[PDB]
Amino acid sequence: MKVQGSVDRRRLQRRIAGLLPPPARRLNISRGSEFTRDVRGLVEEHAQASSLSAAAVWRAGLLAPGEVAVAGGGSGGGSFSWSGWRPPVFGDFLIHASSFNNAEATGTPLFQFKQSDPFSGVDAVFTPLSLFILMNGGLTRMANLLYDSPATLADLVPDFGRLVADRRFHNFITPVGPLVENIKSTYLNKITTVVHGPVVSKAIPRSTVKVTVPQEAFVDLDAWLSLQPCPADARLYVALTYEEAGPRFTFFQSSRGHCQIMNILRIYYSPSIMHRYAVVQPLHIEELTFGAVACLGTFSATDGWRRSAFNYRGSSLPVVEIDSFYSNVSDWEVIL
Amino acid sequence: KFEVLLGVYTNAIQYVRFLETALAVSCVNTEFKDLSRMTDGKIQFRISV
Amino acid sequence: DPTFTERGFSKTVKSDLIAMFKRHLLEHSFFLDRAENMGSGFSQYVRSRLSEMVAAVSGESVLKGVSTYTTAKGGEPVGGVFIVTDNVLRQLLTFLGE
Amino acid sequence: KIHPGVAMTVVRTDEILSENILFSSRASTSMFIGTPNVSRREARVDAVTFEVHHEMASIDTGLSYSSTMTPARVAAITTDMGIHTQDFFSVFPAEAFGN
Amino acid sequence: MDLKVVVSLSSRLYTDEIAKMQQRIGCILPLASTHGTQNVQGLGLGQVYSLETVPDYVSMYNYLSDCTLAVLDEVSVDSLILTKIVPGQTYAIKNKYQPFFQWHGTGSLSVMPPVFGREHATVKLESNDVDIVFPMVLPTPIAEEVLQKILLFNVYSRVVMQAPGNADMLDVHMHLGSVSYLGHHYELALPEVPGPLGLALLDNLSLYFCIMVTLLPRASMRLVRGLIRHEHHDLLNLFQEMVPDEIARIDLDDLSVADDLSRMRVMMTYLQSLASLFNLGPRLATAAYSQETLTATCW
Amino acid sequence: MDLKVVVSLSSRLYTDEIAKMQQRIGCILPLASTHGTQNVQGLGLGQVYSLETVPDYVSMYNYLSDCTLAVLDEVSVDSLILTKIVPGQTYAIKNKYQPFFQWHGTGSLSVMPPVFGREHATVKLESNDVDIVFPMVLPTPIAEEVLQKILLFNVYSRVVMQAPGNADMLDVHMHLGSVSYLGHHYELALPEVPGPLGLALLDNLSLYFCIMVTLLPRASMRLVRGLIRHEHHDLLNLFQEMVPDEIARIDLDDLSVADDLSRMRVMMTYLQSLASLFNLGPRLATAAYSQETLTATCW
Amino acid sequence: MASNEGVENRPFPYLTVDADLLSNLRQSAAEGLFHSFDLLVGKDAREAGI
Amino acid sequence: STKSDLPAVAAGVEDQPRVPISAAVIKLGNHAVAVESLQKMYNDTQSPY
């Protein structure tokens, strides 16, 4: 009848105090002071990097129980999160060195092909320029500059003629995400790509990675069409189109919303569906399917895409680049 | 002409404890400080007939 | 009771035990409810029943020698505890007394 | 109102709210009260959920039973001892005749 | 991290409408832009829905989805304060809608344009000559059903324009205009003339159907034929002992398993994309609910 | 935040039963409630999948879509320990599932009910008189072909069970037994007999597929005919050619205007529900996998 | 039946208790009242050598 | 607390001078209760009780 088995005062006094403080918001600005160490607390971004020393690592806050590094040691950890910040999940691949052209845009999207041989150590990854060559001024001048001997690629895909015939080639490809860091080796390159997270460069002097897609491929969906809403997020899409000439890859950007975008794709592809689905080729079993779309992520609307030149071998290519990309891949949807 | 409040009354909660309750007549209470570690606990009897 | 279980738990002994279980269930349930009709002697009948309850329980506890609870008057180790609803508490208070 | 070929037996189950009397002998068990803890979960944009946690453990002291309880008094009859019969058409919804 | 929107009124609202707005406290409405200070014109669903115009529901769904959603928090003479529903934040949400469909932990909620009643949804602000139209939220099972009633009306009313007789108009109003929920019948306003977006939506639905009929597996059709005659189901009650003429004609060809397998494969691929056509809006997954307090936990 | 659910039990576990559950120590289990201290009756699918009850696929999918998943961590006398699943959280999972499928990194894992026998999913706990059942976790590409193949096997098995000359069972077993993906071959054996209709699992589920497939042509032609307008989708004309000649000639007038509306509703409702299933809604994405460790980093 | 699971006949310094535990032994052992119990008769009653 | 709230709660009866009133009281078990009758006050005014 004395005190209790699980005393409230003992637990509330110490354990509760650490969990209580939430992340600070809406600090008021004083014109007279105009700056304090208090405002630094609100602004500070608390980046996660270190010097490889026992004393510095503790200072850095890298060894934090939760997923995000938090400083102060035991005093830290009360942010409840970092603006719903999730670290980038990374993906490691082991490639042949003749497959991937070491010169790169350091952020270009990567497409992995599922080889059909079991227990295989190495995997195939294709860049947009590389993929164009396999499919068969402009890309054709730049894509061949990067990749010579198209057979070296076609070896990686021994069913390319049979899949496009049955319209199955799209579902064997899975989008992976923008390229981050590259290790060059004469025999097997080691490529690390970010899947499902805010794209961030792992270089120790920090740099801003911005995904690039060639302008010949990039189609602006919203611009092409025609008070109004303006939503924060605008998304990037891919479409694999089985055309009479051969399969093709195009990128779309729009912020309308999903149920609309499917509709937009059909009207956009209406002239090509006719020609391809026209008198020249008769309907046949298993050849009915036309295309497929997948979502690659969300890019802030009204930021836009600056157009920059890709310079290699003393010749350029017009490129569009997306800033602040947050990678979030979807599956493939058949359109027709 | 006005309208008046007439008072504010709130109850006070009463607090009860196990060792205060007479039920505790049965149990014998040991504060094992670290229960989480105990995989299993045993008691053994031996009787001579 | 040990008288019914001296020789052991044979089939016939189990049969007799189940028969007695049935008869007790049918006849002696709700003793508090039965006292009201018991009429004159409810005070003593209820002490009989409560004492039957204290006796059926086994107190051969390894911690029987240790002294934990004693009464407000010296000694008298408190044997056990009854726990009831408030209705039964007022009822027993009246029935038994001080 | 003709007697069919068969007879019937009917089975009903009934419920009675009763007040019980529990007895327990001294030093019958032993409790091991662990350390209490506090946890934080589900930080919505409105509120934060905290949790309180407690661990316990118990054994018996002797060999034979050390407690008992019995129905002392019936406070209510809840079922109503009705003739309400079950609907086999609602129990077996799929089975049906041929027509 | 900070979700706060204040809507500044040009002029004081009248003491009557300030009463009506307070009754809407805690109801989702869409805002145009994601900024700290928003004008009342972007507020609400009013700009797309006008009392003069015939309601085009398909158009409304598109506008609602693209707008940022916010929860009403505070109503004052000068300003309205609302917190915004970002994709990653858990919110406490209240079911205070006057048609009052009960909720459960079961389904995700669905925000819908105000089908049940125009006037019931709008609060007029004659002080600033703007009308504020609150959309409706419903459990997705009931919402999916409602959308189906709307589209089937546009295609039938197109046929029921045939002016062929009275019987056609009555039957369509039955089974389409009314939603039946336990103990009540809640009518759905049906536009006299079908809106263009809806027709243009079914044209997309129609394309899938044309491709799909060829892909149907023969074995499935054959089973139904013998199924309806030998055995009875609640599911088969549409088909009486009578057998549809079309199945008999299609079913004549001999079965092949390699064919149906290839047929079922491609059709399944097509069915998945349809799931994109149907939702037509934003959903809120509900993970908890409290019947006494009418407060769920959305996401 | 803190994700940790501790399940306590009523009676001690046998020495044997621990070994069966040590086997499945890192694997996914659906969880009734989200609170940290919980009973055993809430962590399995035996509630959905009883021995006494007849298993239903649609009932078991509806359950998995709205439930909270959890992963075991420590199995000791007291009460098993699991970690709650949360969006935006990385997890490390092992693939201890009684029928075996290979796992490849950067793919999509999918949670589908256990279609195989009870014993491949369950671990009976006789000490507390409950049987816990684990949902089968599968790579999506294979799960889109197991479901599709086993669905056909029920259709063809019931055909020959009614009309004996309409199929050859050896063709059924040959084209449906083996499943190939990424160079592997996993041979799955379907149940030998559905038994009386409306019994033996998946047979009830097909009815939704079959009934839809028979209504699709009659419903589709009517939908396309009414959709005709001066201003309509340009491809719509091209796809009328796609329809088979047999279906194109049907007479819509043969059915009363009433029944046509009832068929469209049953056909439209079924398609929407069916479409959501083939999505295989609960999904996990994997970033790394190692065959020696059997450990897949997912989220 | 399920004779002994955690019974261990190692020699211990045994505490002497005055409470009479010898009132429900062959009756409880016969039918069964204990999960794990062991009966040592005759020579086996001795303390086992360490 | 219940104690420091005691003065302000009794904004009335506190310091009302006490005089003895005349009415029969009965001990009802553990309670002490008074008992009265107002029939006379209603009678000498020729009214119904």
Q: Distance between CA atoms of C82 and D67, rounded to whole angstroms?
A: 10
DSSP state of F279: T
* b/e code A66-92 from CB counts within 10 Å (16+ = b): eebbbbeeeebbbbebbeeebebbbbe
Which spans in chain G are helix H?
26-31
Question: What DSSP element (H or E) covers A191?
Answer: strand A188-195
Task: Give the number of other CB atoms < 10 A from CB of residue A158.
Answer: 12
DSSP secondary structure, chain H, as one string: -TTTTHHHH-SSSTTPPP------EEEETTEEEE----HHHHHTTT---
Place of tokens 């799931």: E275
Q: Distance between CA atoms of F25 and F73, rounded to whole angstroms?
A: 6
- CB within 8 A of F177, min separation 6: which ones? F187, F188, F189, F190
A119 burial via Cβ count (<10 Å: 0-12, 13-18, 19+):
exposed
A81 touches chain D (CB under 8 A): yes
Structure tokens at G33: 């009242």
Q: What is the largest CA-CA distance in chain D?
A: 73
Place of tokens 């553990």: H30
Structure tokens at A182: 């590259």
Q: Distance between CA atoms of A235 and A258, rounded to whole angstroms?
A: 10
> Are E243 and E196 spatial neighbours (Cβ–Cβ below 8 Å)?
no
Q: Distance between CA atoms of A100 and A122, rounded to whole angstroms?
A: 13
Q: Distance between CA atoms of D18 and D24, rounded to whole angstroms?
A: 19
Determine the distance in angstroms separating the CA of F241 from the nearest CA of chain E, rounded to an integer: 9
> Residue F299 in 3-state DSSP?
coil
Q: Distance between CA atoms of F147 and E271, rounded to whole angstroms?
A: 14
Q: Distance between CA atoms of F41 and F22, rounded to whole angstroms?
A: 19
Q: Distance between CA atoms of E207 and E212, rounded to whole angstroms?
A: 9
Helices (H) and strands (E) in chain B, counts: 0, 1
Which spans in chain D are helix H?
88-91
Phi and psi torsions of D52, nearest 5°: -120, 135
Considering only CA atoms, which of A101, A120, A118, A119 is closest in space to residue A110? Answer: A101
Q: Distance between CA atoms of A127 and A130, rounded to whole angstroms?
A: 5
DSSP state of G29: H
Structure tokens at F261: 């509306």
* b/e code A120-142 from CB counts within 10 Å (16+ = b): eeebbbbbbbbbbbbbeeebeeb
Q: Distance between CA atoms of B43 and B28, rounded to whole angstroms?
A: 15
The nearest alpha carbon in chain F to D44 belongs to: F1
Closest partner residue to G23 (CB to CB) among C8, C60, C62 is C60
Considering only CA atoms, which of E159, E195, E152, E200 is closest in space to residue E177? Answer: E152
Q: Are strands F37-38 and F5-7 parallel, antiparallel or unpaired?
A: parallel
Place of tokens 């009486």: E240
> Are D41 and F2 spatial neighbours (Cβ–Cβ below 8 Å)?
yes
Residues of D within 8 A of A80 (CB-CB) are 40, 43, 48
Determine the distance in angstroms separating the CA of F109 from the nearest CA of chain B, rounded to an integer: 35
The total number of residues written for chain H in this structure: 49
> Are A195 and A329 spatial neighbours (Cβ–Cβ below 8 Å)?
yes
A109 burial via Cβ count (<10 Å: 0-12, 13-18, 19+):
buried
- Cα B23 to chain centroid distance, Å, stands at 10
DSSP secondary structure, A52-116, as one string: SSHHHHHHHT-S-SSSS--SSGGG--TTSSSSS--PPEEEEEEEETTTS-S---SS-EEEEE--S
Residues of B within 8 A of C68 (CB-CB) are 25, 28
DSSP state of F133: E
> Are A39 and A27 spatial neighbours (Cβ–Cβ below 8 Å)?
yes
Closest partner residue to E244 (CB to CB) among F214, F242, F261 is F214
- CA atoms within a 13 Å half-sphere pointing along the CA-CB vector of D48: 17
Q: At what angle do helices E257-279 and F169-177 cross, to 10 degrees?
A: 50
Structure tokens at E48: 């797309």
The nearest alpha carbon in chain H to B7 belongs to: H9
In Å, what is the CA distance from C60 to each residue of A103, D24, D62, F130?
86, 13, 6, 35
E293 touches chain D (CB under 8 A): no
Considering only CA atoms, which of F73, F80, F58, F78 is closest in space to residue F26? Answer: F73
**Which chains does chain G touch, 3 or more C-beta pairs < 8 A?**
B, C, D
DSSP secondary structure, F183-222, as one string: TEEEE-PPPS---STT-STTHHHHHHHHHHHHHHHHHHHH
Strand partners, E71: E28, E83
Instruction: Report CB contact under 8 Å: G28, D63.
Output: yes
The nearest alpha carbon in chain G to B46 belongs to: G14
- Cα A277 to chain centroid distance, Å, stands at 33
A274 touches chain F (CB under 8 A): yes
Structure tokens at A194: 């970010």
Considering only CA atoms, which of F281, F287, F282 is closest in space to residue F299? Answer: F287
**Which chains does chain A touch, 3 or more C-beta pairs < 8 A?**
B, D, E, F
Q: Sign of dihedral through CA atoms G3, G4, G8, G14?
A: negative
Phi and psi torsions of F222, nearest 5°: -65, -40
Structure tokens at B43: 């008691």
Considering only CA atoms, which of F212, F110, F172 is closest in space to residue E268? Answer: F212
Q: Distance between CA atoms of B41 and B31, rounded to whole angstroms?
A: 15
First to last CA, chain G: 29
- CB within 8 A of F157, min separation 6: which ones? F169, F172, F190, F193, F194
Instruction: Report CB contact under 8 Å: D21, C56.
Output: no
E strands along G1-50, which residues? none
Q: Sign of dihedral through CA atoms C76, C79, C85, C90?
A: negative
Phi and psi torsions of E171, nearest 5°: -60, -40
DSSP state of D32: E
Q: Distance between CA atoms of A246 and A250, rounded to whole angstroms?
A: 13
Q: Distance between CA atoms of D34 and B35, rounded to whole angstroms?
A: 5
Q: Distance between CA atoms of E201 and E150, rounded to whole angstroms?
A: 12
DSSP state of F232: -
Phi and psi torsions of E104, nearest 5°: -145, 165
Q: Distance between CA atoms of E277 and A19, rounded to whole angstroms?
A: 45
Task: Give the number of other CB atoms < 10 A from CB of residue E19.
Answer: 11
Q: Distance between CA atoms of F133 and F45, rounded to whole angstroms?
A: 5
Instruction: Report CB contact under 8 Å: D34, B33.
Output: yes
> Are F79 and F6 spatial neighbours (Cβ–Cβ below 8 Å)?
yes
Strand partners, F180: F185
Q: Distance between CA atoms of B27 and D67, rounded to whole angstroms?
A: 12
Considering only CA atoms, which of E238, E276, E286, E228 is closest in space to residue E109? Answer: E286
Structure tokens at F9: 């039990």
Q: Distance between CA atoms of E138 and E181, rounded to whole angstroms?
A: 12
E strands along F46-177, which residues? 68-74, 81-84, 91-94, 108-112, 122-125, 130-133, 136-139
> Are C81 and D24 spatial neighbours (Cβ–Cβ below 8 Å)?
yes
Name the experiment that determined this structure.
Answer: cryo-EM
Determine the distance in angstroms separating the CA of D66 from the nearest CA of chain F, rounded to an integer: 19
Q: Distance between CA atoms of C36 and C31, rounded to whole angstroms?
A: 9
A218 burial via Cβ count (<10 Å: 0-12, 13-18, 19+):
buried
Q: Distance between CA atoms of A227 and E130, rounded to whole angstroms?
A: 14
In Å, what is the CA distance from D25 to each residue of A48, E6, E138?
62, 67, 58
E strands along A222-336, which residues? 233-242, 247-254, 291-300, 305-309, 318-322, 326-327, 333-335
DSSP secondary structure, chain E, as one string: ----EEEE-SSPPPTTHHHHHHHTTT-EEEESS-SSEEETTTSSSTTT--SSSPP-HHHHHHHHHHSEEEEEEEE-SSEEEEEE--TT--EEEE---TT-----SSSPEEEE---S-HHHHEEEETTTTEEEE--EEEEHHHHHHHHHHHHHHHHHHHHGGG---HHHHHHHIIIIIEEEETTEEEE----SS--HHHHHHHHHHHHHHHHHHHH--HHHHHHHHHHHHH---STTSSS-SS--HHHHHHTTSPP-HHHHHHHHHHHHHHHHHHHHHHH-S-EE------TTTTEEEE-
In Å, what is the CA distance from F131 to each residue of D93, F20, F46?
27, 12, 6
- CB within 8 A of F233, min separation 6: which ones? A266, A267, E200, E203, E204, E207
The nearest alpha carbon in chain F to D94 belongs to: F198
Determine the distance in angstroms separating the CA of G16 from the nearest CA of chain C, rounded to an integer: 9
E strands along chain F, which residues? 5-7, 28-31, 37-38, 68-74, 81-84, 91-94, 108-112, 122-125, 130-133, 136-139, 178-181, 184-187, 283-290, 295-298
The nearest alpha carbon in chain D to C86 belongs to: D19
- Cα E169 to chain centroid distance, Å, stands at 23
- CA atoms within a 13 Å half-sphere pointing along the CA-CB vector of D12: 11
> Are A293 and A238 spatial neighbours (Cβ–Cβ below 8 Å)?
yes
> Are A293 and A332 spatial neighbours (Cβ–Cβ below 8 Å)?
yes
Instruction: Report CB contact under 8 Å: B25, C63.
Output: no
Q: Distance between CA atoms of E127 and E17, rounded to whole angstroms?
A: 9
**Which chains does chain B touch, 3 or more C-beta pairs < 8 A?**
A, C, D, F, G, H
Closest partner residue to A6 (CB to CB) among D39, D40, D54 is D54
Determine the distance in angstroms separating the CA of D47 from the nearest CA of chain A, rounded to an integer: 11
Please, what is the Cα angle at F250 between F245 and F251, to 5 degrees?
155
- Cα C69 to chain centroid distance, Å, stands at 21
Strand partners, A315: A312
Please, what is the Cα angle at E175 between E56 and E140, to 5 degrees?
65
- Cα F280 to chain centroid distance, Å, stands at 7
Considering only CA atoms, which of F206, F18, F193, F201 is closest in space to residue F114? Answer: F201
DSSP secondary structure, A5-46, as one string: TT-HHHHHHHHHHHH-PPPP--PPP-TTT---HHHHHHH---
Determine the distance in angstroms separating the CA of B41 from the nearest CA of chain C, rounded to an integer: 17
Determine the distance in angstroms separating the CA of A317 from the nearest CA of chain F, rounded to an integer: 31
Closest partner residue to G20 (CB to CB) among C2, C8, C60 is C60
Structure tokens at G2: 């399920």
